[PDB]
């Protein structure tokens, strides 16, 4: 069933913005996030 | 008559495969060449 396939690499999920001169997106909720950086 | 000289198909080949305990299927890529004479 599973096999080796080839494909074009994706540059990220396409996400458009509803830009306008009379509206703005402001966050109503938030959260905390801990990330790791190993050097 | 003029005749152009071109080195025929030659280019570093490679082989791609996943981990061993995942599967045994393997792929081979002939790079910078058209494998029509293979």
């Amino acid at each position: 069933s599973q096999s080796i396939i080839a494909y074009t690499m994706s540059l990220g999920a396409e996400n458009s913005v509803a830009y306008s001169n009379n509206s703005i997106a402001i966050p109503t909720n938030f959260t905390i996030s801990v990330t790791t950086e190993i050097l | 008559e003029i005749l152009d000289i071109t080195p025929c198909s030659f280019g570093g080949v490679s082989v791609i495969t996943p981990g061993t305990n995942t599967s045994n299927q393997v792929a081979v890529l002939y790079q910078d060449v058209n494998c029509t004479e293979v």
Binding site: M9 | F10, G11, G12
Partner: peptide, 22 residues
């Protein structure tokens, strides 16, 4: 504005110019 058979070759980059422009 900006400008072989002896075992030395060039490899193409993973990210093409079109992806970089995008």
């Amino acid at each position: 504005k900006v400008t072989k058979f002896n075992g030395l070759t060039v490899l193409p980059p993973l990210l093409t110019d079109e992806m970089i422009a995008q």
